[PDB]
């Protein structure tokens, strides 16, 4: 699940200092999850990725977004379909955008199911002021659930 | 009127540069679990950057349970990076 509602008083006291965010839908949201990998590079099946995917789809719907979904895409498919999503005319009449990417990754890049990498800088560029004029000056949220290396953090004791 | 090439984005990362993000095979990833918990409860009265701080607080306290493996008692730290230029409130359910 439940998204607690904003009060009218809260909106009245905060709308002047915030991004404009009142459109219906609030924005388009894209949830892209890769769980099953089949390239030359062995990448482990992402058990529990199913739970993440449905949690975000539910969350973003409940927050008033029109949710688009993609599952198990190659690096090339991800770039193409993200670019297509960024280019949708529907962004012209919404106030914001959400993109969530869930996969295996390395520093600065995420894996497609083919074990090839898409650079995250190229992903953000698709939505930037140059390439995505429909989203200029509108808030764009990205959530990236992927490893950024293979160092495990053993933690430290509190001193 | 001119804009920088990139602005008004906030990006939440499950882990820090060089490190692993953690996922429970049953409950899903630590970061997504925390994100949904916080946003569902607090989107009503907290802006997105401030909610991602609450997510960070939840992640910092979590610890890996996976005895006999590399990950037992492991830690994670999430982060966010922001080019936002004002508060981002999602105003859920307004106007009624």
């Amino acid at each position: 699940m439940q998204v607690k509602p904003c009060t009218p008083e809260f909106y009245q006291t905060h709308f002047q200092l915030a991004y404009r965010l009142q459109s219906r839908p609030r924005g388009l949201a894209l949830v892209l999850s890769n769980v099953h990998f089949t390239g030359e590079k062995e990448l482990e099946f992402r058990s529990g990725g199913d739970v993440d995917h449905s949690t975000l789809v539910t969350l973003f719907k409940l927050l008033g977004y029109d949710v688009h979904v993609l599952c198990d895409q190659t690096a090339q498919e991800m770039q193409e379909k993200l670019q297509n999503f960024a280019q949708l005319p529907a962004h012209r009449v919404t106030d914001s955008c959400i993109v969530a990417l869930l996969s295996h990754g390395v520093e600065g890049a995420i894996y497609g199911v083919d074990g090839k990498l898409l650079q995250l800088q190229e992903v953000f560029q698709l939505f930037d002021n140059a390439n995505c004029p429909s989203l200029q000056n509108k808030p764009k949220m990205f959530f990236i659930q992927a490893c950024r290396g293979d160092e495990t953090d053993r933690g430290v004791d509190q001193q | 009127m001119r804009l920088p090439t990139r602005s008004d984005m906030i990006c939440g990362y499950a882990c820090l540069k060089g490190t692993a993000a953690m996922r429970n095979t049953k409950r899903g990833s630590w970061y997504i679990e925390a994100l949904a918990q916080v946003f569902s409860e607090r989107a009503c009265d907290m802006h997105v950057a401030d909610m991602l701080v609450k997510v960070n607080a939840l992640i910092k306290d979590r610890e890996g349970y996976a005895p006999g493996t590399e990950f037992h008692r492991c830690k994670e730290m999430s982060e966010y990076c922001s080019t936002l230029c004002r508060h981002l409130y999602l105003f859920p359910g307004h106007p009624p």
């Binding site: 482990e44 992402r46 058990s47 996969s103 295996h104 990754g105 659930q145 992927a146 490893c147 293979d150 495990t152 | 499950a14 692993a20 993000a21 953690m22 996922r23 429970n24 095979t25 990833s29 630590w30 890996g64 349970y65 996976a66 493996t69 990950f71 492991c74």
Partner: peptide, 4 residues
């Protein structure tokens, strides 16, 4: 718990 496992790594992504």
């Amino acid at each position: 718990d496992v790594a992504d």
